[PDB]
Design a protein around this ligand. Structure first.
Ligand SMILES: [Cl-]
Ligand SMILES: [Cl-]
Lengths: 250, 250
C-alpha cells in the first residue's frame, strides 16, 4: 500500500520577498522551505509532526548546517530535495540538496533530529515505528555533521548583548517557536559592515533550550576569524542557551 | 506584440510557515504574495518597479485595505488575482481577489498607488506611459477605497508606545522597507487577549512617511470599539507618522 522509501522533491519559483536587499535568496526563506519539504517527507514516512503528536512524542531539531554554494535570485526556479540518510538509537539524520535549473548544487544542508517524550519531558530512544524506516537508496549522503562542535564551548563573556522578545509571528502552527526565528535574530545582530560587504557561505546551528511566546532573549556574537563569527542566543533571565552558531562569510 | 490588458492570476499552495499559531494563513504572508502578484502584473503592463526606476520614478503604496472573508489553511491551494481597475491623474487603483478551490471569495484587497519623482523627491502626475494603460474589461471592481479615512485624525496622545527598529530583514530587493514590515509590527503590538480570542476581519492601511534601515519607530494602538482597534506607527525621533490603521476583529 505504501512505497518503502521517499525522496521529497519540490520545485519552487523564488518570490521577490524571498530575496534580501542584495537580491539573493534569504537564508530564513530557504530554511523555512527546507522545514516544509522535511515535514512533507516525514508525513510520507508516517513520522510527521501530527503522527508523533498523536503518539505523545515530538521532534526536536538539534543540529542544522546549511552551506550556500551559490545564491539563487528572483524568479529562479529551484529544486529542493530532502530525505533521511541514517537512523540510529536516538537520532535521525536528514539531508537537503537544492538544485538550479542548471543542475548546479546551489545549497545543501545536514540536520540531526531527536524525539522528545511528552510524558517524560526529555529525549527518548526513537520509537520502533521510526527506527524501522528505510532511508532512500541511490542518494549520495552529505558528509557527517559533528554532534558537538568545538564552538559550542566558546565564551561570549565580553560580547555585548542585544535584547529581543519572542513574538506571536514567531510561533508556528504546531504552537512552537519556529526554529527559523532564531536565525533571523542572529542575522539581524551581525555587524552592518559585514552585512553590507560579505555573504554567508555556511551557517552551523546548535539548538539547546526551547523558548516560548514573550520570552526575552539576548543575542551576542564574537569575531572568531577574518571570515567567521560565533553567535549565541540565550534566555535573558535564566541565562540558559537557546542557540549557538558559527557563520562563515565570503 | 503585447495584449491590451492583463489579469494576473497565480495559484499558490499554502506552506506551513505561511500559517499562524492557529493554523490560519497569516496576513503578512498574504500581503507579501499580493505584492508579488501586483509586481508581476505591473511588469506585463510595462509599469513594473524596474520600468519606473529606469525612467527616474518609483511607486509608493498609499492605501491598502484587506478583507478576509475566510482564512485558508495549511496545504489549501488558493488563486490570487490582481489588476488595475482605474487610473486617474495621480493614482492607480488596484484590486486583489483570492479564491478557494471551492470558488469561495476567501479575501479581497483594494489599494491606491502614486508615483514619486526621483528628481523632485515628491509625488507627480502619473507619466503618460502609465495614464495610457487599459485596465482589464470583464472584472467586477471592488467598492471605492476612501483616500483619507476618518481614523487618519484619531489621537494616540495617551496610548503607550512600543519601540521597534527597522532591521536588515525588513529591507526588500528594491532597497526599500517592505510595506509588510509595518503590518508585522502592528500585529505584534495587539493585546495578547485579542490575538488569543479573535481574528482580523479587515485591516485598513494608510501609509505616510518612508522609513529606512535602522530607524527607530514607535508602535501604538487604541481601542476604538468592541471589535475595532486603531494603530499608529511613527518615527520615534521626528514624530512623523509612518502608518495609520484600523483593524476589525471577529
Ligand atoms: Cl568547531
Ligand atoms: Cl473612518
Amino acid at each position: 500500500s505504501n512505497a518503502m522509501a521517499f525522496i521529497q522533491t519540490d520545485t519552487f519559483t523564488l518570490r521577490g520577498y524571498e530575496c534580501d536587499a542584495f537580491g539573493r535568496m534569504s537564508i530564513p526563506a530557504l530554511m523555512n522551505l527546507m522545514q516544509e519539504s522535511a515535514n512533507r517527507n516525514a508525513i510520507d514516512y508516517g513520522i510527521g509532526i501530527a503522527d508523533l503528536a498523536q503518539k505523545g512524542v515530538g521532534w526536536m531539531l538539534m543540529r542544522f548546517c546549511l552551506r550556500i554554494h551559490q545564491y539563487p535570485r528572483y524568479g529562479d526556479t529551484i529544486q529542493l530535495m530532502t530525505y533521511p540518510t541514517t537512523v540510529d538509537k536516538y537520532f535521525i539524520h536528514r539531508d537537503f540538496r537544492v538544485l538550479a535549473t542548471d543542475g548546479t548544487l546551489l545549497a545543501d544542508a545536514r540536520s540531526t533530529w531527536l524525539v522528545f517524550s511528552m510524558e517524560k519531558r526529555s529525549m527518548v530512544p526513537l520509537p520502533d515505528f521510526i527506527r524501522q524506516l528505510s532511508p532512500p537508496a541511490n542518494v549520495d549522503p552529505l558528509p557527517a555533521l559533528p554532534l558537538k562542535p568545538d564552538f559550542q564551548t566558546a565564551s561570549f563573556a565580553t560580547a555585548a548583548s542585544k535584547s529581543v522578545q519572542v513574538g506571536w509571528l514567531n510561533i508556528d502552527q504546531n504552537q512552537h517557536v519556529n526554529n527559523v526565528a532564531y536565525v533571523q535574530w542572529l542575522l539581524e545582530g551581525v555587524d552592518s559592515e559585514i552585512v553590507q560587504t560579505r555573504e554567508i557561505a555556511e551557517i552551523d546551528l546548535v539548538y539547546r533550550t526551547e523558548s516560548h511566546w514573550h520570552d526575552w532573549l539576548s543575542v551576542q556574537s564574537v569575531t572568531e576569524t577574518d571570515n567567521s563569527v560565533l553567535h549565541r542566543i540565550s534566555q535573558t533571565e535564566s541565562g540558559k542557551d537557546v542557540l549557538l552558531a558559527r557563520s562563515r562569510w565570503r
